[PDB]
Design a protein around this ligand. Structure first.
Ligand SMILES: Cc1ncc(C(=O)Nc2cc(Cl)cc(CN3CCN(C(=O)C4CCCC4)[C@@H](C)C3)c2C)cn1
Length: 230
């Protein structure tokens, strides 16, 4: 019922290994490459692309991102033991939320640029999409998250808890999800206490804010998918 220190340490290690096995680019590489910024020629090139081409570019990126998140979820202890309903409930709510959180790794707060197709560019890069307000919202959320200066280990633990969330409506074995959520909270708090970083807990975004942004994101994605299916 009350996991030992050894159990908690092993869970931290498990989650962090699972995460590193399931992310595309190393954070160190994203950080190093912040100086590589799209030229004006490249930006205007992107802006002159059709809406549909830009949609394809973004949708294929998101497909890859979601695929990695699903693989991460399945590697979390206990997840594959949950009934199918609960797995689906958690993934349908949580996968795109984790995708959004993982985006902050590729966000540069110094100049409000993001990594996309080999270099950093501002929100202007995506003009052809005609989604200025939504993209601004994504940049804003990422800027707030960027302020925590997450380690990869912290992102692993935080995103585990984004997924393993017993407060999702529709769950049929809430106790089982609650148990997994608690164990993961114990892992997160242990790792933060070890590293003297517990203060970051009072700086995480409200879970509702993440859900709302996800809802707004998915709404627009469904529109593009309807107009131009991938
Ligand atoms: C290899 C690799 N790793 C990580 C990353 C990355 O996260 N970049 C990244 C990070 C942040 Cl904070 C914001 C953005 C902006 N874009 C805008 C387009 N977009 C959409 O969904 C549109 C589709 C229709 C609706 C809006 C999203 C992909 C977000 C990006 C690209 C990239 N490449």
């Amino acid at each position: 019922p009350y996991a030992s220190l050894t159990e908690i340490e092993h869970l931290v290690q498990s989650v962090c290994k699972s995460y590193r096995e399931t992310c595309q680019l190393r954070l160190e590489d994203l950080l190093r490459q912040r100086s590589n910024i799209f030229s004006r020629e490249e930006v205007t090139g992107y802006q002159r692309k059709s809406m549909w081409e830009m949609w394809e570019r973004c949708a294929h990126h998101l497909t890859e991102a979601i695929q990695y998140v699903v693989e991460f979820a399945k590697r979390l202890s206990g997840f594959m033991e949950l009934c199918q309903n609960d797995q689906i409930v958690l993934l349908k709510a949580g996968a795109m939320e984790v995708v959004l959180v993982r985006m902050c790794r590729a966000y540069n707060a110094d100049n409000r640029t993001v990594f996309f197709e080999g270099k950093y560019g501002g929100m202007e890069l995506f003009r052809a999409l005609g989604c200025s307000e939504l993209i601004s919202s994504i940049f804003d959320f990422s800027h707030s998250l960027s302020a925590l200066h997450f380690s990869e280990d912290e992102i692993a633990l935080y995103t585990a808890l984004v997924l393993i969330n017993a407060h999702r409506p529709g769950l049929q074995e809430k106790r089982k999800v609650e148990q997994l959520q608690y164990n993961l909270e114990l892992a997160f708090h242990h790792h933060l206490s070890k590293t003297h970083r517990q203060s970051i807990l009072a700086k995480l975004p409200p879970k509702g804010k993440l859900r709302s942004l996800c809802s707004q994101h998915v709404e627009r994605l469904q529109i593009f998918q309807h107009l131009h299916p991938i």
